């Protein structure tokens, strides 16, 4: 009998309302408008992926997080990590991504006493006033493109909760689109042999669309994966948070 | 054609999600500091629930409490992660000695992060140095018994998320204290499928209040199992008990 399957589905659908409530959608739309786009597709109804955003007068903090697991266990991690990120932003400010990650790690260790509790994160402080960007990541990269060149600011090879973090500071040039993605989109199986999309198809896709309006890029990226994937099930939670300077 | 493998996947996922929820519980700290001066009864309705409990040891005393978040199952379990972190923030912002201030601050921390979102909580600051207690609750009571009388320090009839004060009380020797969510008192059973209730609960506490707390815990489980019979578990159950002298 599939009556139990209906019960769980209704329970998870309501749990997705809780997980959506912790996402900064409204704030992103109201402050960045079309100078951002969000792609957020959990594998199940609730996932282990989420994203953060904190607007300041002089710039903004923006990031993506992939907590251990997907489904319900991943979604539980997402609640803890969202609160751990808020604590960290309050303890060290929103301008130092490496300090935020260090403090997030500590806050997580403080709440969780064999359990996979590690998490990937890519955090960026966009300092509009001083025209420079600070990035710090644990197994998450910052991709940047002007439609000609594709740069990848690689994150540390260590996940949060196992590592000391450092910021990568780049000049902030106009005409550049930035992309923060979890592994899910790049790991999506598909195509002729069932290989994951990968870093090379991803960098090419970004360069190809980087100069385009971000609402158009978002649509093209969704249609590019839908096409690639075909009949293959979604392998992992997908998140792409994009933002553009001038 | 019956894709039953999905039901296995979800079951294994929930069982692993219960390891995450158990990791946020202060079991180890409670056992290491209170030993047999405490007992915990924690039984979610499903694999994961909306109920949890807190504990924070200080040099001069301890903070102990129970929380019942909106819902049960997975949605309830998501609320517990948020509330656990909101309680940590509140303890850091106002200290672990003012239960009413902790509840106020927990409410604010919850409103900043987030739909039924209200929650019940009963928080107690046990002062060892002043030989007193401070209690504040939102739809949760503090029960006390010496095996003869039963005292109930009632919490506000409003939940955290609607509209808090401390009730200070002296610690007399031979008294056992009990913090329970509504789940045990709402358990359907008996002759007419009625919930256990406050009067059967007070009598149960009085009947066992003189026993070692590991024995009380067992008697409480056997009392509900008997009452419940064939009735399914109606809600998440939590009983956190503590004793001084
Ligand atoms: Mg994950
Ligand atoms: Mg990975
Ligand atoms: Mg992933
Ligand atoms: Mg509940
Ligand atoms: Mg109730
Ligand atoms: Mg309840």
């Amino acid at each position: 009998m599939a009556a139990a399957q209906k019960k769980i589905g209704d329970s998870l659908d309501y749990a997705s309302l809780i997980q959506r409530a912790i996402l900064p959608d409204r704030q992103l739309s109201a402050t960045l408008g079309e100078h951002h786009f969000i792609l957020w597709k959990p594998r199940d109804v609730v996932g282990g992926d989420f994203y953060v955003y904190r607007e300041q007068a002089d710039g903004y903090l923006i990031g993506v997080v992939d907590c251990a697991g997907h489904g319900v266990p991943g979604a539980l991690m997402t609640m803890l990590a969202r609160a751990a990120i808020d604590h960290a932003i309050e303890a060290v400010g929103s301008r130092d991504p490496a300090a935020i990650l260090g403090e997030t790690d500590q806050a997580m260790r403080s709440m969780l006493s064999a359990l996979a509790t590690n998490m990937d994160a890519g955090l960026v402080w966009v300092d509009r006033r001083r025209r420079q960007l600070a990035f710090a990541g644990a197994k998450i990269s910052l991709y940047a493109s002007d439609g000609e060149e594709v740069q990848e600011l690689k994150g540390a090879r260590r996940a949060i909760g196992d590592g000391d973090y450092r910021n990568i500071e780049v000049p902030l040039a106009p005409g550049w689109t930035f992309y923060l993605s979890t592994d899910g989109f790049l790991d999506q199986a598909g195509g002729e042999h069932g290989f994951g999309f990968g870093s090379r198809r991803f960098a090419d896709m970004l360069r190809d669309h980087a100069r385009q309006p971000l609402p158009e890029q978002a649509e093209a990226f969704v249609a590019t994966l839908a096409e690639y994937q075909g009949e293959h099930p979604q392998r992992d939670d997908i998140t792409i948070l994009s933002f553009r300077f001038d």
Side-chain angles (χ1 to χ4, degrees), chain A:
Chain A
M1 46 194 265
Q5 205 93 104
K6 298 169 181 189
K7 282 198 183 80
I8 299 150
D10 296 339
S11 183
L12 294 167
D13 281 334
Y14 181 70
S16 70
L17 270 159
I18 294 162
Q19 184 163 61
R20 278 186 174 272
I22 70 121
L23 309 168
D25 292 1
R26 183 207 173 105
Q27 304 98 283
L28 278 160
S29 287
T31 64
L32 291 186
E34 292 194 356
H35 276 250
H36 102 285
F37 79 69
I38 181 61
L39 206 178
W40 184 75
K41 176 67 188 77
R43 190 187 106 158
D44 314 313
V45 192
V46 293
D49 271 24
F50 77 107
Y51 47 104
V52 292
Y53 175 69
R54 180 71 66 97
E55 192 213 11
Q56 294 292 163
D58 63 320
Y60 54 92
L61 177 74
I62 194 165
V64 293
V65 182
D66 180 353
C67 299
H70 53 81
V72 173
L76 291 183
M77 287 301 291
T78 239
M79 304 292 122
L80 292 171
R82 158 72 204 265
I85 280 168
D86 285 23
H87 164 88
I89 297 169
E90 189 171 316
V92 297
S94 56
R95 307 187 173 85
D96 190 340
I100 296 159
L101 292 184
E103 273 298 317
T104 298
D105 189 0
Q106 291 308 308
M108 284 300 302
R109 296 182 192 274
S110 143
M111 298 183 286
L112 290 167
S113 81
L115 242 164
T117 63
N118 64 335
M119 66 182 60
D120 302 340
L123 269 178
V124 174
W125 162 254
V126 177
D127 193 327
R128 295 149 71 254
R129 191 188 67 95
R130 283 188 68 256
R131 247 117 142 163
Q132 81 166 234
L133 185 142
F135 163 70
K139 288 178 69 192
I140 285 181
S141 305
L142 175 73
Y143 275 97
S145 188
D146 65 344
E148 222 95 46
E149 186 183 338
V150 182
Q151 302 195 150
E152 187 191 352
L153 292 195
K154 295 157 196 78
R157 288 204 121 94
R158 307 163 305 279
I160 286 145
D162 277 25
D164 219 86
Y165 300 108
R166 183 189 61 86
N167 291 319
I168 296 161
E169 297 169 278
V170 289
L172 187 62
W176 286 76
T177 310
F178 297 87
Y179 306 87
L180 279 170
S181 169
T182 57
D183 61 8
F185 193 103
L186 286 83
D187 291 350
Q188 185 55 57
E192 305 184 277
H193 313 97
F195 291 147
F197 194 78
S199 301
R200 297 158 202 202
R201 289 181 183 99
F202 188 74
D204 289 354
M205 184 185 67
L206 301 188
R207 182 195 63 249
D208 257 78
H209 296 90
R211 233 173 286 200
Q212 298 311 285
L214 274 75
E216 298 171 20
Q217 294 193 39
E219 194 267 354
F221 293 184
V222 164
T224 297
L225 197 67
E227 174 131 348
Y228 186 72
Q229 189 180 336
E231 247 80 284
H232 287 81
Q234 193 181 331
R235 197 150 205 171
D236 192 15
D237 298 315
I238 294 160
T239 316
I240 303 187
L241 187 41
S242 179
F243 59 102
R244 172 167 167 111
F245 187 71
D246 270 39

